[PDB]
Design a protein around this ligand. Structure first.
Ligand code: ADP
Ligand code: ADP
Ligand code: ADP
Ligand code: BEF
Ligand code: BEF
Ligand code: BEF
Ligand code: MG
Ligand code: MG
Ligand code: MG
Ligand code: ZN
Ligand code: ZN
Ligand code: ZN
Lengths: 369, 366, 343, 126, 369, 126
DNA sequence: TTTTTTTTATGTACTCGTAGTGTCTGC
DNA sequence: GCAGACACTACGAGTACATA
């Protein structure tokens, strides 16, 4: 009969459960959507977690005798059962009727199950392009671009992040209409040019899914979905049929001014200005001179903040105001020693880059103030 | 278990083709013509009273819109999409129990899937059931979606009260209002359903079951199942009549009819029954007073019938025509005095009996 | 500060968008059509980003910060839509609109809709700040005198043959609900591809979805139309309007009627109406009402009204919706009322 | 009698089988026929005045639904399920005191667990 | 309103500012409740925070020129301004009318004030008794009983905790009508029994003030108020008036049944069993048999959980149903290795105690059996 | 000072045993018979006019029910439970002024807390 | 063509924004 | 450490509805 005979080690099980339980959350669209799909087959267990737009499957090898089968188990309950058991303790699992018996030494739990046929399964597809990337490369691509992504926008185009691939270069683009972040990294393989959209939750799962090890990462992009392989984890998410602009078009094609400044000092100054800036109407103004890069802000409390830097400059004076939070996010994403800032006009865009790196580019749109 | 298998008449016999929906001809014909000409509005909002097929017709629309044979008024049962509609497991049909997912979080999560193309259907069809209850911010999200809807998404809203819906959603939705089913149609389909099953039935019993339900087909089928259970496997006239007497509620009307005809035994039996069916005597006497007021008013102008008495009009017209206004005025005065006098009397059943006796004593009937 | 009707809106729309458009009125259909036309012409002019905000005492007020004047990253011209509450703006909403108008620019088109503003609010600082920049659109429901012409015009818009009897039936069933009328015309076009409209089915594909107001009920009472008065009362009861507002609306006019009838024995009604400041629309109506009614009928009406008020505010009973009905019949073309039923 | 525990007559003499219920011949006959013949409906509403049996008959129906001897119109007192129902400790007889759990969140919670199958019972009763 | 020129260093203020921050900001119930009281007097700076029923002031030495006075400065704004400055950067403050100009290097901030007179204070009083207890001992006293306090219960008594003394022992009692937590520790001084009741919030700030340092916490017990002293920090609060339940009357009278086991094993087992417990009641049933413990848990989802513990038991088997959250909290507080339990009857209170020493004790009232 | 505040006769002369009742003999006989035998009930509703004794009768019933002498028709003032019931501060006797707390939230909290076992008392009297 | 128009006291849900509290994760 | 993040839970406020 169909029995989920399992004899696993808690150390081989905690991490895969910690990964598969990520995308799952409270209040699912269906009760089946709130239960992880266990599938023991051949000699491995597949852990499946889905949101109707994701499938996160973790394969764990087995040694002890077991019988094939498929069922579902509550995510949080089973994960905490695995977590709470002592280090190095075996976990035995069985299925009796509609009850999953989880035993360990003398501890015994009987969780409620559901049929495995009702669990949705994403349709099969063919991969159009395949990438092989290091963990650090994808990590930097995501962390340096995802901050500028839009949030719950009416235009569904901007809810995600764009991957643009050309030759031996892969770049990530993210914008909300006011900010834009792009980052390009090299790859050792020749790849066709392709632009693809990944939803916000999809890129969040992609970022959390990759480990800190040296295991290579595999990417597959098809017609309408994306898949990622990392060790024994496979994550597949649907895409978005969207339109995105040129990064070169948004950024100043012919920059007019150049600034080079220390990142930490500018972060501290902008935070200090944001202290007295309106909590909702977050925004400051900068006035540029050869050395003075004054930052000014004020609140409806008539509390004013003005601060001065010592930044190299040789051009004309300029007054440009914009949201403080945008530049704070840009600087926090930079994590560099020195920052270069390019200004063209008050009603035109403002570019920010790493003084010793062209890999990542950031542009902010200043607001009239 | 050891009882073979017997489903519920309410859930079973739900139509699977547009020809199996009984009544509501105008809605079905309009939908058929709209699908034939290719003129489909962005959002269809169904409305009407309980148990007239709003959800069933919306489900039929969702089955038709994604049929592989094409958009038609009569989708086949052949299509695997049609079969998945039958089983309730269809990727391209999103059934949202808005009565349960009222919060803006779940509504926004389910409405953020408009950006994704349908898996195996021409149109991503949302069946948002019980739309009337929905948080205000969820209404804002739904309105923002409907203002700029993708060409591959059609909305199918269903509700019982369309008043609670905001006007901003009504102005963007093609609204189809469904009538309460006529008694003859209800009786006809009840006869056909009882004949299709292996259940004997009687004509007068069927008419009683049809009249008992207030124009709602689900009410008729539920009473049919309950009577079959009580009827020992047979829909017999005496059993269903006794059942409906037990479930009889409009006592005040029968009390008025017996009082105006000076039938002492009938009114005593009626008040005994109303006592057995535990109720409030003040409420019964207020209902009697209101019915007498309405009868007095109708004699002055027929337009006083209104809409509330749609299922009561037949008896009220006869009562208004056959009874002089002076007698109605005297009865109203007697019942008003009795209601003022009721709480101070003995246990209120005694007071109601005494007031009815006072009203009966006026006529010379012996 | 331009003023227009919906029919003329295209004339202003095809000429060039102004700084802002104000859509004032109480017709959902007319306001929706005007807003949709403005949005369509703005999209034709190159307006892509649309943001809708509902003015509420607890709503978000990020619209002020939404005027970043920096869309240039994508450079998609924005359209802002504001929904005023049922009673219109308040003081707080007043200064919110002040600070929104102060930040208006060329790239943004503002669409403001809501119930028609009163004279006290038509002189508000923000509304004045929209002078020479705004186009008000008047969308007020045509009355039953003007409604059939509008129905015929919309039928000609859809190229449907409308019969006079069908027009009367639709006017009677859908009074005060223009959106329902448009939906009915669309539904009858779908039901009959031939395009004609006659009685045998327009009397079938229709419901009593009419929406009324207490003023309509009081007008029906003054004109003595019992059937219309009772139908209006039933529609108001189904809609769920509070009976106290009906009581007050009828009380004002009934007290005025009593005073005018008392004074009529010494002064002509023409001077009495002017002294009491009765508008030309209601002068003839009240004259006919006075000529129809006697002092005894008005006394019975006020006695019934007092009893209804007491039974509403003291016993908390639900019999009011019945008593009002009788009061209706008490004042229309020989009431023939009773005493025990009311007194 | 012999029970030194003077249990309240309102509690000690709660009906055990359909033979112990006085009156209500309508509902008793209806339930007996709809359980002997089959065709068990999925929702019941017992409407009546106070202290007539609006709950005890529901418990009797619950006993009659999931009994060891199958769907029966005569609730036995021998199998574990019926006695567990009577003691109020039964696993599947979820007694929702709607007076306490009246908020919509609690109803959503109740509906969330509806599909999670019954344990040691033919049906789960809410 | 004289000019107010501060000249201070961050390292001497950020810790006092954090200590005086406490329950400030958050819910502003009225403006003149205010933000801070800054007072310059005799070369010392007194910084005061309040809650309309509580007060606390930090003393900072002024080793530089100053101007005596009293004014206010916004809590969050001042705290974030001081925090964001470069490490070790000086702060120069000036007063112009009602405006505070705060300068750090070339950074300038303007701040609004309120008159110092409008601030609400607490009337002075004559102290009744006084203790000087070591910080570690006070922390042990508080942590052993903090968790058991009631959560906005109607019985106001349960909303706080009682400190009493008998000769050289200080006893602390907390309860909520279902839990009891008593802890008696030596003092070294003998003072008469003057019981005091401290509300939950006040206890929270007492915990926050303690830093585990060598300086002994001084406390002044009054009639309807409390004062505390930690180095340069002064604190005061109101008191809950009434009498606590007699703990000796709550402790079991016949603790005949004895049990001893390991704290870690019991805590882990109860944590495992609480997963399947009823989230609205958290009731678990305990069966005590010969040298064996059994925990059983059920939830409305009909899931069953059983756990068995090796234990030493010489009495008779017993069934008792009680909350698992309470025992988990008790075991969390109990930081030693071996724990003993005293039981009397199936519906009798259970006493939890340290096996190493009497020290502190706890009482749990069982659920319906 | 024996009277720190004026212990008005309406408060000082509250009955302490069943013998201080001014003649509510018809209910007192039933109460004494019930306590003397094992016949004890879980819901007593005393009603009548103002200032007639039903709160005092209820307090006397609680004293008789919780005194450590036993379930006595005549409570003993020597009992510690009686000493605490006559004053305030009894862990078991929970007195709720219903008019003071009419909200359903307080009643729901009370019914959540009723599940716990009584502290050192035979019956948790509400 | 234009404005016209309300009865409170007490209580109970419902839903969203903002803050207070725990805790624990690679930071 | 560890504080921020992130969850999670609670509380106020605005809104809708019920009963008397
Ligand atoms: N027009 C109809 N034709 C046939 N059956 C109907 C119709 N309307 C209601 N019913 C019956 O009532 C049951 C439930 O109908 P449903 O369409 O769910 O009502 P609702 O409008 O309240 O959602 C159906 O299974 C069907 O038996
Ligand atoms: N039909 C009946 N037959 C026998 N006893 C009954 C009946 N109705 C009520 N009772 C008595 O009332 C007690 C509680 O009845 P219950 O069924 O809870 O009424 P309710 O319908 O109000 O919940 C039972 O224990 C029983 O003694
Ligand atoms: N039966 C009685 N015997 C003695 N004193 C009584 C009696 N009934 C009332 N009293 C007096 O009345 C005062 C209030 O009595 P109480 O029991 O509170 O009445 P109630 O039933 O209205 O709450 C008592 O303090 C006592 O002096
Ligand atoms: F499903 Be229906 F609205 F009763
Ligand atoms: F006591 Be019954 F359920 F009304
Ligand atoms: F004054 Be008593 F409680 F009726
Ligand atoms: Mg439905
Ligand atoms: Mg009951
Ligand atoms: Mg009393
Ligand atoms: Zn098909
Ligand atoms: Zn059995
Ligand atoms: Zn005693």
């Amino acid at each position: 009969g169909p029995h989920m005979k399992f004899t696993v080690e808690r150390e081989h099980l905690l991490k895969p459960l910690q990964q598969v339980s990520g995308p799952l959350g409270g209040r699912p669209t269906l009760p089946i959507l709130g239960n992880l799909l266990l599938q023991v087959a051949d000699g491995t267990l597949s852990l499946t977690g889905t949101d109707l737009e994701m499938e996160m499957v973790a394969r764990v090898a087995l040694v002890q005798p077991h019988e094939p089968g498929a069922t579902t188990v509550p995510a949080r309950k089973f994960f905490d059962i695995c977590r709470g058991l002592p280090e190095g303790a075996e976990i035995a699992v069985q299925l009796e009727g509609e009850r999953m018996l989880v035993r360990s030494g003398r501890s015994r739990f009987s969780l409620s199950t559901l049929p495995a046929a009702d669990f949705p399964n994403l349709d099969d597809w063919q991969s159009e392009v395949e990438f092989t990337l290091p963990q650090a490369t994808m990590k930097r691509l995501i962390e340096a671009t995802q901050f500028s992504m839009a949030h719950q926008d009416v235009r569904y185009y901007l809810n995600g992040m764009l991957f643009e691939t050309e030759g031996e270069e892969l770049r990530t683009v993210a914008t909300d209409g006011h900010r834009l972040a792009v980052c390009s990294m090299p790859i050792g393989q020749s790849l066709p040019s392709h632009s693809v959209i990944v939803p916000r939750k999809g890129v969040i799962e992609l970022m959390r899914m990759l480990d800190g090890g040296d295991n290579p990462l595999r990417v597959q992009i098809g017609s309408n979905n994306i898949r990622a392989h990392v060790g024994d984890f496979i994550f597949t998410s649907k895409l978005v049929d969207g339109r995105f602009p040129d990064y070169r078009r948004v950024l100043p094609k012919n920059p007019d001014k150049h600034l080079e400044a220390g990142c930490d000092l500018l972060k501290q100054a902008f935070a200090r200005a944001a202290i007295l800036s309106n909590e909702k109407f977050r925004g400051v103004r900068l006035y540029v001179s050869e050395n003075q890069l004054k930052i000014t802000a004020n609140n409806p409390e008539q509390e004013e903040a003005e601060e001065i830097l010592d930044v190299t400059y040789s051009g004309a004076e300029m007054e440009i105001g914009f949201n403080v939070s945008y530049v704070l996010d840009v600087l926090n994403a930079l994590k560099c020693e020195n920052v270069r800032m390019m200004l063209t006009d008050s009603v035109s865009s403002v570019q920010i880059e790493d003084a010793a790196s062209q890999s990542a580019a950031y542009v902010v749109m200043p607001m009239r103030l | 278990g050891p009882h073979m298998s017997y489903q519920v008449l309410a859930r079973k016999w739900r139509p699977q083709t547009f020809a199996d929906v009984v009544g509501q001809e105008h809605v079905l014909t309009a939908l058929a013509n709209g699908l034939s000409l290719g003129r489909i509005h962005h959002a269809y909002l169904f409305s009407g009273t309980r148990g007239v097929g709003k959800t069933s017709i919306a489900r039929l629309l969702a089955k038709g819109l994604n049929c592989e044979t094409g958009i038609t008024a009569t989708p086949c049962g052949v299509c695997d999409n049609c079969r998945e509609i039958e089983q309730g497991r269809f990727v391209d049909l999103i059934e949202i129990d808005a009565a349960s997912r009222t919060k803006v979080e779940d509504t926004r999560d389910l409405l953020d899937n408009v950006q994704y193309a349908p898996a195996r259907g021409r149109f991503k069809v949302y069946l948002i059931d019980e739309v009337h209850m929905l948080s205000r911010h969820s209404f804002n999200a739904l309105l923002k979606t409907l203002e700029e809807p993708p060409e591959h998404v059609k909305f199918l809203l269903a509700t019982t009260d369309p008043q609670k819906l905001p006007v901003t959603i009504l102005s963007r939705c093609l609204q189809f209002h469904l009538k309460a089913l006529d008694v003859e149609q209800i009786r006809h389909q009840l006869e056909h359903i009882l004949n299709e099953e292996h259940i004997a039935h009687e004509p007068r019993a069927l008419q009683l079951l049809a009249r008992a339900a207030e124009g709602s087909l689900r009410d008729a089928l539920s009473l049919t199942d309950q009577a079959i259970a009580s009827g020992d496997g047979q829909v017999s006239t005496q059993a269903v009549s006794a059942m409906l007497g037990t479930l009889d509620d409009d006592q005040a009307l029968s009390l008025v009819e017996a009082m105006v005809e000076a039938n002492g035994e009938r009114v005593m039996a009626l008040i005994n029954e109303a006592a057995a069916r535990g109720i409030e005597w003040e409420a019964l006497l207020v209902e009697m007073l209101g019915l007498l007021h309405r009868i007095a008013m109708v004699q002055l102008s027929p337009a006083a019938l209104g809409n509330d008495m749609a299922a009561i009009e037949l008896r009220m017209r006869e009562l208004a025509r056959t009874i002089p206004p002076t007698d109605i005025q005297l009865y109203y005065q007697t019942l008003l005095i009795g209601r003022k006098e009721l709480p101070y009397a003995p246990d209120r059943r005694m007071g109601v009996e005494m007031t009815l006796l006072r009203a009966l004593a006026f006529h010379p009937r012996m | 500060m331009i003023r227009l009707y919906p029919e003329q809106l295209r004339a202003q729309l095809n000429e060039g968008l102004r700084a802002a458009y104000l859509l004032l009125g109480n017709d959902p259909l007319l306001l929706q059509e005007s807003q949709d036309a403005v949005r369509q012409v703005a999209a034709a002019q190159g307006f892509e980003e649309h943001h809708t905000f509902s003015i509420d005492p607890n709503t978000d007020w990020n619209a002020i910060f939404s005027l970043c004047q920096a869309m240039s990253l994508f450079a998609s011209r924005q359209t802002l839509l504001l929904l005023l509450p049922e009673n219109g703006p308040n003081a707080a909403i007043n200064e919110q609109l002040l600070t929104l108008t102060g930040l208006l620019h060329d790239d943004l088109l503002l669409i403001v809709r809501g119930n028609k503003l009163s004279k006290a609010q038509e002189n508000a600082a923000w509304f004045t700040a929209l002078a020479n920049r705004s186009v008000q659109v008047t969308c007020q429901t045509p009355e039953q005198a003007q409604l059939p012409r509008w129905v015929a015009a919309r039928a000609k818009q859809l190229n449907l043959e409308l019969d006079d009897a069908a027009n009367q039936v639709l006017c009677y069933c859908y009074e005060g609900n223009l959106l329902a009328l448009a939906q009915a015309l669309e539904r009858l076009s779908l039901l009959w591809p031939d395009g004609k409209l006659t009685l045998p089915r327009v009397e079938q594909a229709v419901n009593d979805a009419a929406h009324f107001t207490p003023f309509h009920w009081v007008d029906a009472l003054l004109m003595g139309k019992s059937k219309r008065a009772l139908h209006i009362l039933q529609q108001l009861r189904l809609e769920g309007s509070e009976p106290v507002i009906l009581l007050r609306t009828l009380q004002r006019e009934l007290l005025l009627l009593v005073n005018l009838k008392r004074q009529s024995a010494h002064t002509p009604l023409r001077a009495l109406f002017d002294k009491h400041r009765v508008w030309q629309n209601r002068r003839g109506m009240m004259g006919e009402a006075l000529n129809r009614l006697s002092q005894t009928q008005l006394r019975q009406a006020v006695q019934l009204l007092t009893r209804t008020e007491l039974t509403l505010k003291q016993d908390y009973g639900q019999s009011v919706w019945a008593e009002l009905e009788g009061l209706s019949l008490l004042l229309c073309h020989k009431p023939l009322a009773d005493v025990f039923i009311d007194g």
